[PDB]
Amino acid sequence: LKDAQEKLELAEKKATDAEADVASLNRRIQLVEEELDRAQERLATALQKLE
Amino acid sequence: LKDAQEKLELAEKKATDAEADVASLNRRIQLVEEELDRAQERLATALQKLE
């Protein structure tokens, strides 16, 4: 049980770290997605101006 | 020991799944950043042609 508890602590710390990484990376994903959406809207407007 | 090992198993599974999610989100970040860069380049070229 002692070794199992120590491994539990290590695993939960690592999982929490990876969950924070998930939160940060998903925030980056959404922000870059919004920037890409703005870029493609600008591209559509540019093609309209070309026409 | 049964409870301790069950907790170990659940924590390890959660940490492994979180690591996989982190890797997937990071590769998603790089993919979306590449797409964003291409969109920005297209925007610049289109604006120049428009002018």
Swiss-Prot record, chains A, B:
Compartment(s): Cytoplasm, Cytoskeleton
Induction, per UniProt: Induced in stimulated quiescent cells.
Domain notes: The molecule is in a coiled coil structure that is formed by 2 polypeptide chains. The sequence exhibits a prominent seven-residues periodicity.
Record note on quaternary structure: Homodimer. Heterodimer of an alpha (TPM1, TPM3 or TPM4) and a beta (TPM2) chain. Interacts with HRG (via the HRR domain); the interaction contributes to the antiangiogenic properties of the histidine/proline-rich region (HRR) of HRG. Interacts (via N-terminus) with LMOD2 (via N-terminus) and TMOD1 (via N-terminus).
Further facts: The sequences of cardiac and skeletal muscles are identical.
Protein task: Binds to actin filaments in muscle and non-muscle cells. Plays a central role, in association with the troponin complex, in the calcium dependent regulation of vertebrate striated muscle contraction. Smooth muscle contraction is regulated by interaction with caldesmon. In non-muscle cells is implicated in stabilizing cytoskeleton actin filaments.
Family under the similarity heading: Belongs to the tropomyosin family.
Name the UniProt record assigns to this protein: Tropomyosin alpha-1 chain
Name of the gene this protein is made from: Tpm1
Region of the whole protein represented: 64 to 114 of 284
